mmCIF file of C-alpha atoms and ligand atoms in Angstrom:
data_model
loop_
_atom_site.group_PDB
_atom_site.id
_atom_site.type_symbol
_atom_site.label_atom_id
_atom_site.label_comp_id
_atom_site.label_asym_id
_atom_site.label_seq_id
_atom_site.Cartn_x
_atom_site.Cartn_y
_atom_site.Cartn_z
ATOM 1 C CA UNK Y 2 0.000 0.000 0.000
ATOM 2 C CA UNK Y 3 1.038 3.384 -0.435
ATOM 3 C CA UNK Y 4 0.194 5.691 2.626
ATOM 4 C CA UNK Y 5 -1.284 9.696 2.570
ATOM 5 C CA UNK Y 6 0.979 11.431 5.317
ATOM 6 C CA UNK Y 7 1.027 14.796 7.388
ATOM 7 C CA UNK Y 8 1.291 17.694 4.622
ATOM 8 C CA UNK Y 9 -1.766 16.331 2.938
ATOM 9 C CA UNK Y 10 -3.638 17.616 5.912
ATOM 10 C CA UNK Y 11 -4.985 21.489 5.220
ATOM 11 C CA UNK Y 12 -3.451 21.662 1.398
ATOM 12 C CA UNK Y 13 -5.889 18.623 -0.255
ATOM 13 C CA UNK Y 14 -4.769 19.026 -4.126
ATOM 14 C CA UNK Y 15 -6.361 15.888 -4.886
ATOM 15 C CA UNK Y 16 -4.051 15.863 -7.813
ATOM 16 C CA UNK Y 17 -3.628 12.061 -6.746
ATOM 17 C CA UNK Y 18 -6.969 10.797 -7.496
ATOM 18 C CA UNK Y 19 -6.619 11.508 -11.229
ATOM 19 C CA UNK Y 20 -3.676 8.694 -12.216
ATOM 20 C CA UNK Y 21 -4.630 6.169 -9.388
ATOM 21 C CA UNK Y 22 -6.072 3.198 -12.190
ATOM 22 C CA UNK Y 23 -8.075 1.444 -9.195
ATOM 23 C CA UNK Y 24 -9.917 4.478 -7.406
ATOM 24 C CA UNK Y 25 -8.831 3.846 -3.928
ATOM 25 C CA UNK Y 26 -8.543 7.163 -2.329
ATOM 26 C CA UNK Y 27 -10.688 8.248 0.191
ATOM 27 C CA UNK Y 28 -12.093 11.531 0.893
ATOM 28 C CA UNK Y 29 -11.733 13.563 4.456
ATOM 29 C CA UNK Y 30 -13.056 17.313 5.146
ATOM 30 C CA UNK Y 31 -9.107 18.561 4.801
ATOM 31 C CA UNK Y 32 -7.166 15.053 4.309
ATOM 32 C CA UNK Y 33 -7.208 12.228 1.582
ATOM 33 C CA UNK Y 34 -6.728 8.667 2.642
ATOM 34 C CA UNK Y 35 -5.192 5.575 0.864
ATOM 35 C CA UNK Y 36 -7.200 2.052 1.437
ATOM 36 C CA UNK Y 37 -4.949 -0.210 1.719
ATOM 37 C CA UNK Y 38 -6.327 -3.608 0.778
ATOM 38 C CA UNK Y 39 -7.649 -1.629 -3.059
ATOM 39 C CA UNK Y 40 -4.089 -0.056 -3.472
ATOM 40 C CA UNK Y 41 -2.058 -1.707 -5.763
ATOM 41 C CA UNK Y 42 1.378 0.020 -5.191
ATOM 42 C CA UNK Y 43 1.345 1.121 -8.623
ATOM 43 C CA UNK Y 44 3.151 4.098 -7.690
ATOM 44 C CA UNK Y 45 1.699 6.697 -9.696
ATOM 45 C CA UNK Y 46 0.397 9.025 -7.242
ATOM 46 C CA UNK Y 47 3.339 9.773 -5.574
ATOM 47 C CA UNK Y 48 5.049 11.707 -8.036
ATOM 48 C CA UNK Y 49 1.222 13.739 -8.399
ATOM 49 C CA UNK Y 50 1.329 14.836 -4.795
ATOM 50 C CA UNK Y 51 2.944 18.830 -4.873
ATOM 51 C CA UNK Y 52 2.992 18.390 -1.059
ATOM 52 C CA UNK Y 53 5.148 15.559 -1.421
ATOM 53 C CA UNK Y 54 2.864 13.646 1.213
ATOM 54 C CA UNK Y 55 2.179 10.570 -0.345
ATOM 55 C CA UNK Y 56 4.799 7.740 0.698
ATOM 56 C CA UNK Y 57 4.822 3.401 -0.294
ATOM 57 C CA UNK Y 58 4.299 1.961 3.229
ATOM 58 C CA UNK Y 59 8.011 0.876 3.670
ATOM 59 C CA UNK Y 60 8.838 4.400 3.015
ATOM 60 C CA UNK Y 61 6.992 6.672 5.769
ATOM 61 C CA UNK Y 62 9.325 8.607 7.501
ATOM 62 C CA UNK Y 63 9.849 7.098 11.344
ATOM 63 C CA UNK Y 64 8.056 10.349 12.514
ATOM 64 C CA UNK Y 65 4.543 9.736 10.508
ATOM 65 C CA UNK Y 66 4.456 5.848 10.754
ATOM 66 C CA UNK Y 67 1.053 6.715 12.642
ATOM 67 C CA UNK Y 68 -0.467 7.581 9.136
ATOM 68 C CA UNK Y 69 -0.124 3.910 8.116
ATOM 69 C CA UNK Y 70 -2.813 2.617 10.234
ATOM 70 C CA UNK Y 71 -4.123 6.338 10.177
ATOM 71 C CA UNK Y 72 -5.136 5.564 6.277
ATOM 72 C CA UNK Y 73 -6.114 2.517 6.789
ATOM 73 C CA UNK Y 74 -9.007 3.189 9.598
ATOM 74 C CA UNK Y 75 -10.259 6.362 7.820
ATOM 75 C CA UNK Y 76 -10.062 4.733 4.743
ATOM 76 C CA UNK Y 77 -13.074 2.678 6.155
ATOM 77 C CA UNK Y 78 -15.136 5.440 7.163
ATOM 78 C CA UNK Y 79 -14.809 8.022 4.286
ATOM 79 C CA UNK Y 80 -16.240 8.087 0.977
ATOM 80 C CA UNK Y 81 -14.847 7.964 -2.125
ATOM 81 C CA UNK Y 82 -12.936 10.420 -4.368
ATOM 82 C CA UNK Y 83 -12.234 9.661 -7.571
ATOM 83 C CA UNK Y 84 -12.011 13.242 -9.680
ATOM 84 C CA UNK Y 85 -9.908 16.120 -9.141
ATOM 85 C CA UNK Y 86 -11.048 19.152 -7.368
ATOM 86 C CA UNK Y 87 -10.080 22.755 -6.808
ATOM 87 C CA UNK Y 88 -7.224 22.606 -3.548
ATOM 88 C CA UNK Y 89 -7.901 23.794 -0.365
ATOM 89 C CA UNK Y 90 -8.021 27.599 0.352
ATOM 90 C CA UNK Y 91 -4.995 28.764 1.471
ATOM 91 C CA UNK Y 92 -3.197 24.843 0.569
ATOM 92 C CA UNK Y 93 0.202 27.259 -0.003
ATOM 93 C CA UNK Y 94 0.462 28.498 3.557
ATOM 94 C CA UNK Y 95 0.021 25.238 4.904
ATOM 95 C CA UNK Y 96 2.323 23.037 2.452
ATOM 96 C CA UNK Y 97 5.594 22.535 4.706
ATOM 97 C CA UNK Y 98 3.664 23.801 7.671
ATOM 98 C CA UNK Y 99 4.619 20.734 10.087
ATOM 99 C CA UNK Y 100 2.571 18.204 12.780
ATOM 100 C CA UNK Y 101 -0.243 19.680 11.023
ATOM 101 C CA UNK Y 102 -2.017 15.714 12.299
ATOM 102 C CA UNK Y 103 -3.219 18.390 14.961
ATOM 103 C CA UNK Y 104 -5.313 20.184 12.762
ATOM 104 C CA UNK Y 105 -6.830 16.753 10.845
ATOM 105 C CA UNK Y 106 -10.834 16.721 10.504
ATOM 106 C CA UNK Y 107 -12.844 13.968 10.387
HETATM 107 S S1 LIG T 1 -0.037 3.589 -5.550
HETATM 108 FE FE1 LIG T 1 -1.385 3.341 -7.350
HETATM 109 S S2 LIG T 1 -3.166 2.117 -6.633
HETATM 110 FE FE2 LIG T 1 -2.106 2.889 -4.789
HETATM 111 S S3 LIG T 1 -3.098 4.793 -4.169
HETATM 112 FE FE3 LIG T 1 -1.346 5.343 -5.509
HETATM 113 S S4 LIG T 1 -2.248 5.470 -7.566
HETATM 114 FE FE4 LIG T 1 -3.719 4.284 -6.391
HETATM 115 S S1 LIG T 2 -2.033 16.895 -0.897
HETATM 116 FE FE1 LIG T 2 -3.289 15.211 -0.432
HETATM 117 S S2 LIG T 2 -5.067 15.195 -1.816
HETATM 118 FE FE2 LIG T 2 -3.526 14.038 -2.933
HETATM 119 S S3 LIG T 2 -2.354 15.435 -4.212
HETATM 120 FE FE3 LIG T 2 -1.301 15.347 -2.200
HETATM 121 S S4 LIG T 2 -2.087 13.471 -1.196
#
């Protein structure tokens, strides 16, 4: 699986959705999630992601390894996104803003 991780959080480009060929992101109020199990570690999203957020599970940075399970639990409970849409307002002062897990919606 490939994993959504903290910058995601209050930017939202949802420039990932468009390549991912199986549909398996999931949609939060200010956050994206990855489901696991539907993932098929294709890889495309990653390079998508401006906010550089999106990681394959072996590589999440020590400091965000809470996002793996993160995804996965959200991923159950969210619907589905699987078109582009406009980011969030203000995404560009948030992107490199960090532990922004503190400001995640559900
Ligand atoms: S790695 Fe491929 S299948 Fe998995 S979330 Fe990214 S685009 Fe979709
Ligand atoms: S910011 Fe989030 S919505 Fe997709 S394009 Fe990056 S993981």
């Amino acid at each position: 699986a490939f994993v959504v991780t903290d910058n995601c959080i209050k930017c939202k480009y949802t420039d990932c959705v468009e390549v991912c060929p199986v549909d398996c992101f999931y949609e939060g109020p200010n956050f994206l999630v990855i489901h696991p199990d539907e993932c098929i570690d294709c890889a495309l999203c990653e390079p998508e992601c401006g906010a550089q957020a999106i990681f394959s599970e072996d590589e999440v940075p020590e400091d965000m390894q809470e996002f793996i399970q993160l995804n996965a639990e959200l991923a159950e409970v969210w619907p589905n996104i699987t078109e582009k849409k406009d980011p969030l307002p203000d995404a560009e002062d948030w992107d490199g803003v960090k532990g922004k897990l503190q400001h995640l919606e559900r």
